[PDB]
Amino acid sequence: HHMLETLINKIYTGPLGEELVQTLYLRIWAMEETPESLKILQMREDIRDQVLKMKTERWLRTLIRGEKTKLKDFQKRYEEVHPYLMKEKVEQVIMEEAWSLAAHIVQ
Amino acid sequence: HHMLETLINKIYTGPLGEELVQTLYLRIWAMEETPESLKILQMREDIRDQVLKMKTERWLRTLIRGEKTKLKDFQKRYEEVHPYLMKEKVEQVIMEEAWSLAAHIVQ
Amino acid sequence: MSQWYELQQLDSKFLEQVHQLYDDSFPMEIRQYLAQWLEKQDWEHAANDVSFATIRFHDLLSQLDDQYSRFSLENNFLLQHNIRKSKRNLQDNFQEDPIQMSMIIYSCLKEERKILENAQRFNQ
Amino acid sequence: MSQWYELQQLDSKFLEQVHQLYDDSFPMEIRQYLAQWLEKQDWEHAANDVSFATIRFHDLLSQLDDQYSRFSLENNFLLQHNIRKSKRNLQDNFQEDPIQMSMIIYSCLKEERKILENAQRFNQ
Ligand SMILES: [Ca+2]
Ligand SMILES: [Ca+2]
């Protein structure tokens, strides 16, 4: 998938990624606190930025696997990981932002 | 190449490899000394054993690349690396032992 | 006290067996960096239950994020890069059928114990 | 004083560029472990001369043996394993047309300098 690769490159090196990680930081601050949200909030800022980009990439590659992917496929792949997201509230937040980024580059 | 993989596994874990590394140690002792032969002769014995097996594997994978390989192909692949072996006398010794091991498992 | 630590104390004859075990099965880098976490999980159950295996697959990716943040604190740029490569490869290789990752992990941990068995029996 | 060392001192914005550079081009592990040796060779000439590139390809494999013996002395079982995997992969990937390894290595070192160029120009 070409645009996935460029989306990810934009996340790591472009302004798109700076906007992503600022959104994520505030959403993770605003969420009801978990041990995982606290450790992210306590990370040094540059490391937190890197982890949040990596965590977003994990969900993008979950929703988009192959150049064949169509937005119809998003729902199955989200439900496949839904039980995981239920015990990982921070990942649920990050999955929502990946969903929006991924939808804008697929079918 | 199946038998290449089993030959290499024999080199690392089998008696075939113990015989190989004892032969190589004595040949490298007996050769007119180079800086490279001296550093091999000065290695701790277990590390020397590992390096000699690895150096033999490098030449086996040079002579045998693909399951398609036939002994006719050996000569070209040896001549391809001959200028390298000319400046690396220790590798010339190890290539000779790899040649014998490889010939016995190909065409 | 980890099984990974104990394996590394064996003699070269048995370390060679561990090398062969980790020739294109499961990445040894991950086996080491997540040794404590990996050795805790019930991979046998995961190898027999797709839904559980799917949770453990995504648990593993998140554990690699935790490893990344430690290496980042240590200013270790190569291992930061390697963790990211490791995650990508695991997702490429296993996300279509994550139960197979659990089968492989359980099997590797099993073979490690068998190698350890040799080493203690050979030592006497 | 190595170029590899200087790259690692850059800010995260530029380290991200180095990550992208080493996404399936040349293995970053080898770039680091052989930094001093790699930065010495005339890869530009090798990229334009098959016979020279062939010598440098086999030189590189032998330099990885030297690295292996150092990690072995340090009792570093994982990096021993990684060096051996690195050698196998390089031979699989490049031995049919070794000049292409030199083209890639020269190009990576070039892109590293361009990234460094950004960092010093952006710093002012
Ligand atoms: Ca709470
Ligand atoms: Ca001499």
Domain that holds residue D113: 1-123
Nearest CA in chain D to B39: D66
In which region does residue B43 sit, left (phi positive, over 0), alpha (psi from -120 to 50) or beta (all else)?
Answer: beta
**CATH number of the domain where residue D9 is located:** 1.10.532.10
Contact between C77 and D29 using a beta-carbon 8 Å cutoff: no
CB C91 within 8 A of CB C85: no
Nearest CA in chain D to A14: D13
Residues of C in contact with A91 (CB under 8 A): 58, 62
Gap between the Cα atoms of A97 and A95, Å rounded: 5
Contact between A9 and D13 using a beta-carbon 8 Å cutoff: no
| B74 Cβ neighbours under 8 A, 6+ residues apart | B63, B99, B102, B103, B106
Give the method used.
X-ray
Residues of B in contact with D72 (CB under 8 A): 44, 46-47, 50
Residues of B in contact with D91 (CB under 8 A): 58, 61-62, 65
Q: C-alpha angle D50/D55/D59, rounded to 5°? A: 145
Q: How far is C-alpha C73 from the geometric centre of its chain's CA atoms?
A: 23
Domains of chain B: total: 1
Is D28 in CB contact (< 8 Å) with chain C? yes
Greatest Cα-to-Cα distance within chain A, rounded to the nearest angstrom:
39
**Residue C87 CA neighbour count, 13 Å, CB half:** 27
Domain that holds residue A65: 1-107
D19 closest CB neighbour out of A12, A46, A49: A12
Contact between C29 and D77 using a beta-carbon 8 Å cutoff: no
Is D13 in CB contact (< 8 Å) with chain C? no
In which region does residue A34 sit, left (phi positive, over 0), alpha (psi from -120 to 50) or beta (all else)?
Answer: beta
CB C29 within 8 A of CB C89: no
- Amino acid at the residue C23: D
Gap between the Cα atoms of C76 and C118, Å rounded: 36
Q: At what angle do helices C77-94 and C50-73 cross, to 10 degrees?
A: 170
| Residue B89 CA to ligand 2 centre (angstroms) | 10
CB A2 within 8 A of CB A67: yes
| Residue A32 CA to ligand 1 centre (angstroms) | 5
Q: What is the resolution of this structure in A?
A: 2.0
CB D107 within 8 A of CB D38: no
CB A28 within 8 A of CB A42: no
Give the DSSP per-residue string, chain B.
-HHHHHHHHHHHHSHHHHHHHHHHHHHHHHSPP-HHHHHHHTS-HHHHHHHHHHHHHHHHHHH--STT--THHHHHHHHHHHHHHHH-HHHHHHHHHHHHHHHTT--
Structure tokens belonging to residue D12: 């995260």
Gap between the Cα atoms of B43 and B52, Å rounded: 11
Give the DSSP per-residue string, A35-53.
HHHHHHHTS-HHHHHHHHH
**Residue A18 CA neighbour count, 13 Å, CB half:** 5
Best mutation site among C11, C14, C16 for testing chain B: the one with the most B CBs within 10 Å?
A: C16
Between the alpha carbon of residue B83 and those of residues B27, C17, D51, the distances in Å are 21, 35, 9
DSSP A33: P
Q: Does B touch A (3+ CB pairs < 8 Å)? A: no
Domains of chain D: total: 1
